[PDB]
Design a protein around this ligand. Structure first.
Ligand SMILES: NC(=O)c1ccc[n+]([C@@H]2O[C@H](COP(=O)([O-])OP(=O)(O)OC[C@H]3O[C@@H](n4cnc5c(N)ncnc54)[C@H](OP(=O)(O)O)[C@@H]3O)[C@@H](O)[C@H]2O)c1
Ligand SMILES: NC(=O)c1ccc[n+]([C@@H]2O[C@H](COP(=O)([O-])OP(=O)(O)OC[C@H]3O[C@@H](n4cnc5c(N)ncnc54)[C@H](OP(=O)(O)O)[C@@H]3O)[C@@H](O)[C@H]2O)c1
Ligand SMILES: NC(=O)c1ccc[n+]([C@@H]2O[C@H](COP(=O)([O-])OP(=O)(O)OC[C@H]3O[C@@H](n4cnc5c(N)ncnc54)[C@H](OP(=O)(O)O)[C@@H]3O)[C@@H](O)[C@H]2O)c1
Ligand SMILES: NC(=O)c1ccc[n+]([C@@H]2O[C@H](COP(=O)([O-])OP(=O)(O)OC[C@H]3O[C@@H](n4cnc5c(N)ncnc54)[C@H](OP(=O)(O)O)[C@@H]3O)[C@@H](O)[C@H]2O)c1
Ligand SMILES: CC[C@]1(C/C=C2\CCCc3cc(OC)ccc32)C(=O)CC[C@@H]1O
Ligand SMILES: CC[C@]1(C/C=C2\CCCc3cc(OC)ccc32)C(=O)CC[C@@H]1O
Lengths: 249, 249, 249, 249
C-alpha cells in the first residue's frame, strides 16, 4: 500500500499477461498507470478490469510516430513519468536452419528496436530518480531449442540495462532487467499447435523448475513493483530472475 | 498492509548495521524478530531501539551449542520460523602472502561454517513455504586487493543458496543470497582507524559505484524484505546485488 | 605438431585485425583458410601477407547472396568446413539519446543478423565434430558509455553460442564465443581521428586492464585456436574472455 | 609440441586422474614436472607411467610443513616454477541436515585451505609472467543435491582466482580457474556404494551434458595446458568451463 503513491507509470505490453497484472498491482500501490498496446479491444477490456487510475493508449512500439503520440499524451495528461516498464515482447520458435530474414526482423523489431525507442522517447518525461524496468527472459542465459532469435534478443535487452545504468546514473534514474521464467499467460501457449500441448507444456515447465510450478503473473508483477519502488533504491543494472530457481541451480 | 504480519524472523548479526536495520523494517512490517549477536550490550541497545516485538539472544554462530540455545529460545517463545536472515559476518584484510591459519579460520568460521550451522539448526523450526536469506557480498564476484579469504567465503555463501534451493524445494522453502556493495555500517571501516580515513574510504566507495553514493542500511533491509516477503514468492536461488550498480556495469 | 593439419577454416572479417591474425595462426597450424571481407584491396593484401593455403573471398555478410556465393566457392575448392570463425563486426558509438534507426540497423545487421546467416549457411558444409567460434566482446557484459547497440548486439552473439550448442549437439559440433577486451586493431580507434587520440585511447585501455596492456591480435588468435583445436574438445557453449582480466576482477 | 619447453611445472593431486593426465601432457610439451600427492605407491606408479622429466614428491597439501618441504625440493632441483596447477581436491556428499563439523573441515581443508597455502608458498619460486591454474568445478555454479560443502568450497576456489589476479598482476603472473564437468576418473565413483552405480552414474552425467558423454582426463589436461601455455597470455582471472556445455545451456 502507497508504495507508488501519486507516481506516474507507463507500461508497454499492458493489455495482457504480465503487463496487466503489473498495472493492477501498480494501481493498488497508488500509481496512475498508462497501459500501452496495439489492440484497442483488449486495452479497454483491461482498463475496465484495472478499474481506476488507468489510461489506455493504442500504440505499436515498433513505430516511432506511435511513440511520439504516446508521450504527447503522457505529457498532456500527467506531465512526467516516474516508472517505465518496457515490457513489450514476443516469441516465435524457429531453429537456426529455419530462420528467415522476416522472422529475425519481427523478433528484433519488437524485442529490441521498439524497446530502445520506447526508452529513448521516454527520457524527456522521466523524472530524475525515476525507475525503468526492462523485460528480459531466462531464455537470455539459456540454450533453448528453436529460441535462437528470441533468446539473443532478450540477452540484448539485459545488456541495455547495463549501458543505460551508466548513461542515466547522472540523473539517478535506475534501470534494471527482470528475467521471468515460465509465467502462466498467453505467451506460453500462443505457441502450441492445439490445447492438448498447452497443459503438458506447463507440466514440463513446472518439472524443470525447483519450485515445481509455473509462476503467476501477479508474482512477476510483484518483482517489477520491487524494482519500481523505493525498496530497490540501491539496486541498479541488475538481472532479477523470477523463475522459481530454474536458472540458478 | 504489513508485509510480514505476525511472521517470526530470526536475524543473526541483528545488533548492528544491516541486521539491525533489517530488524527495524521487519518489525515495522508486523514481524516478531529475534536478533542474535555476541555482544550483550549492543543486543540490549538494539532491542531498545527496535522498541517492540523483539527478543535479543546472545549467541556466537561459530559455537554449535550457542545455536542450539538460540533455537530452543525461538521454539519456546514463538514455536516456528518464517524468515531466517543468516547475516552475521566479518571482514579482515590480508593479502595472500600475509594469510595465516588463524586468519583463514577466523574468516571462514563466521562467514561460512557458522552460516551453514545457523541454517541447518533452523530447519526443524522453519515452516514450509518459509524464506531464507544469506548475506553474501559483491566481494564474492570481484578481485579486491587483500580480501582473499573474505571474498572466497562470500562466494561460498552464494553457492549455498543454490544447493539449499535444491535441497529444500520439497518443503517450498526459498533460499536467496543478497550481495551488498558498500553499505554505511561499521563493516566498511574494518581496516581504518581515524575519522578522516573512514570518511575518505566512504568517498572512494561512493566514487566507485554508478549511483555515486554509499548505500544506507535501510536500503539493504528493504531488499532483504523483498526476499523475505511474498513479493519474491517466485524468486529462488538468486544473488540479488544491492550495490548501486558496482558489479553490473 | 600442427594443431589444424589439413583442416578447412572460414573466417569472416579475415582481411584485418583479429581475423587476419587468426588466419595466419591457422595457416601456421596446417589449416587451409578462406578469409572473407568486403574490401577487395585489403583481401588481396591479407592473402599476400598470409602467403599460402589461403583463398580470399569478397562477401558482405549482411547480404544473403554474398554468403551463398562464399559457400559455393568453399564447396568447390575444399568441399567441407572444419572450423568457422564468425568474426566480422563493427562498433559505432552513440548514446541512447543519439540512436537512430539507421545506426541501430547498421550495428545489428553486421554483428547479429549477418552472423546468424553466416552460420546458418555454413551448416551444409560443416563436418560433424566441427568447431564454430563467434566473436562477442567484453562489451556484452559491461555498461560502457555510448556503446548501447554494439554491446547489446555482442550479448546477442554470446546467447547464440548457447542456443547453437543445443541445436547442433546431435552433429557433435561445438560452438563457443570468444569475448576480446581491448585488442590492438583498427576497431579500437572507432571513435578517434588523430594519432595522439589513438595512443591516448590505448593507454587508457591498458590502464583499465589488470595485465596493464592492450592485447595483441596474435593473442586473440591463439585463444581462437584453442576453441578451434582438439584441445577444447570438451568445451561447448562457453564465453572465453580474453581481456587481461578486465571483466573478471 | 614445445609449448612448455624447459618450463618447470608443479601439479598437486598429481598421481591420479586429472593431475596425472595433465602431467603427461605437460611432459609431452617439453615441461619438467613435479607431481605431488600423499600416497608414495601411486606417485612412483605415476612417475613411471609419465616416464621422463617427472619427479614425485610426497606431501599432504593440508600440512604447512609438507609444503615447505615440497618447495625446498623444487628450489634445490629446478630453482623456480613457471606453472603451478593447484589441483588437489575431494568430494564427499552430505545434505545440509547431515553436515557435521568434521565433514565441513575435511572439505574446506583440502579444497580451500590447502589450496591457499599451496599458492602462498609457491610465490617466492614462481617466475614473473608465470601461470597458476586452480581446479574449481561446475559444482561451484550449480545447486547439486548433497554437494553443499564441496560446491561452496569450489566457488571459493573460483573467487581466489579473481583476488589473486588483482594481487599478482604487478608480477604479470596469470591466475585462472578451470571448472571441469563430469570427467572419467576415480573422483566420479570414489562415491558410489558399488560398481552397479558406477556405470549408471556416468550415463546420467552423459545424459545431462550437451555433448552427451563424460569428458576424458586428457581433455581437461588440454584445457589446463591452454591456460599454462602462452596461447592464453591475455587470459586472466577466468573460469574456463570444461563440461561439454553442462553449465552453459
Ligand atoms: N513465460 C512467460 O510468460 C515469459 C517468459 C520470458 C519472458 N516473457 C516476456 O514478458 C513480456 C510480457 O509477456 P507475457 O508473458 O505477459 O505474454 P502476453 O500475455 O502475450 O503479453 C505480451 C504483451 O506484449 C504486447 N506487445 C506485443 N507487441 C507489441 C507492440 N509491437 N507494441 C506494443 N505492445 C506489444 C502485447 O499487447 P498487444 O498485442 O495488444 O500489443 C501483450 O500485452 C514479454 O516481453 C515476454 O517476451 C514472458
Ligand atoms: N558494506 C557493507 O557493509 C557490507 C558489504 C558486503 C557484505 N556485508 C555483510 O553484511 C553483513 C552485515 O554486516 P554489517 O555491514 O551490518 O557490519 P556490522 O555492523 O559489523 O554487523 C556485523 C554483525 O554480525 C555480528 N557477528 C559477527 N560475528 C559474529 C558471530 N561469530 N556470531 C554472532 N554474530 C556475529 C556482529 O555482532 P557481534 O559482534 O555482537 O556478534 C554484528 O551484529 C555481514 O555478513 C557482512 O560481511 C557488508
Ligand atoms: N578491441 C577489439 O579489437 C575488439 C574488442 C571486442 C570485440 N571485437 C570484435 O572483434 C572482431 C574483429 O574486429 P577487429 O578488432 O579485428 O577490427 P577490424 O580490424 O576492423 O576487423 C573487422 C573486420 O570485419 C570485416 N567486416 C566488417 N563488416 C563486415 C561485413 N558487413 N561483411 C564482411 N566483413 C565485414 C572488416 O573487413 P571489411 O571492412 O573489408 O569487410 C574487417 O575484416 C569484431 O567482431 C569486433 O567487434 C574487437
Ligand atoms: N568429474 C570430475 O572428475 C571432477 C569434477 C569437478 C572437479 N574435479 C576436481 O578435479 C581435481 C582432481 O580430481 P580427479 O577428477 O582427477 O579425481 P582423482 O583421480 O581422485 O584425483 C584427485 C587428486 O587429488 C589428490 N589429493 C587429494 N587430497 C590431497 C592432499 N591432502 N594433498 C595432496 N594431494 C591430494 C589425490 O592424490 P593422493 O590421494 O595421492 O594425495 C588425487 O591425485 C579435484 O580438485 C576435483 O575435486 C573433478
Ligand atoms: C569488501 C567489500 C565491502 C564493500 C565495499 C566496497 C566494495 C568494492 C568497491 C569499494 C571501493 C573502495 O575504494 C576503492 C572502498 C570500498 C569498496 C567492504 O569493504 C566492506 C564489506 C563489503 O563486502
Ligand atoms: C567497446 C569495447 C572494445 C574494447 C575496448 C575497451 C574495453 C572496455 C575498457 C576500455 C576502457 C577505455 O578507456 C577507459 C578504452 C577502451 C576500452 C572497444 O572499444 C573496441 C571493441 C571492443 O569491443
Amino acid at each position: 500500500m502507497y508504495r507508488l503513491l501519486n507516481k506516474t507509470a507507463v507500461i508497454t505490453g499492458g493489455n495482457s499477461g504480465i503487463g496487466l497484472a503489473t498495472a493492477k498491482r501498480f494501481v493498488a500501490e497508488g500509481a496512475y498507470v498508462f497501459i500501452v498496446g496495439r489492440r484497442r479491444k483488449e486495452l479497454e477490456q483491461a482498463a475496465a478490469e484495472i478499474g481506476r487510475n488507468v489510461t489506455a493508449v493504442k500504440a505499436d512500439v515498433t513505430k516511432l510516430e506511435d511513440l511520439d503520440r504516446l508521450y504527447a499524451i503522457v505529457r498532456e495528461q500527467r506531465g512526467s513519468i516516474d516508472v517505465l516498464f518496457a515490457n513489450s515482447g514476443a516469441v516465435e520458435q524457429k531453429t537456426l536452419e529455419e530462420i528467415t530474414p522476416e522472422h529475425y526482423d519481427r523478433t528484433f523489431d519488437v524485442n529490441v528496436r521498439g524497446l530502445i525507442f520506447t526508452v529513448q522517447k521516454a527520457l524527456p518525461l522521466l523524472r530524475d530518480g525515476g525507475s525503468v524496468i526492462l523485460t528480459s527472459s531466462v531464455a537470455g542465459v539459456l540454450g533453448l531449442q528453436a529460441h535462437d532469435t528470441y533468446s539473443a534478443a532478450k540477452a540484448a535487452v539485459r545488456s541495455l540495462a547495463r549501458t543505460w545504468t551508466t548513461e542515466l546514473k547522472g540523473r539517478s534514474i535506475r534501470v534494471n532487467a527482470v528475467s521471468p521464467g515460465a509465467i502462466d499467460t498467453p505467451s506460453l501457449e500462443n505457441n502450441v499447435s492445439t490445447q492438448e500441448e498447452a497443459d503438458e507444456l506447463r507440466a514440463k515447465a513446472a518439472a524443470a523448475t525447483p519450485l515445481g510450478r509455473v509462476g503467476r503473473p501477479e508474482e512477476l508483477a510483484a518483482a517489477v513493483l520491487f524494482l519500481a519502488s523505493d525498496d530497490s533504491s540501491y539496486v541498479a543494472g541488475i538481472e532479477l530472475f523470477v523463475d522459481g530457481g530454474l536458472t540458478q541451480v
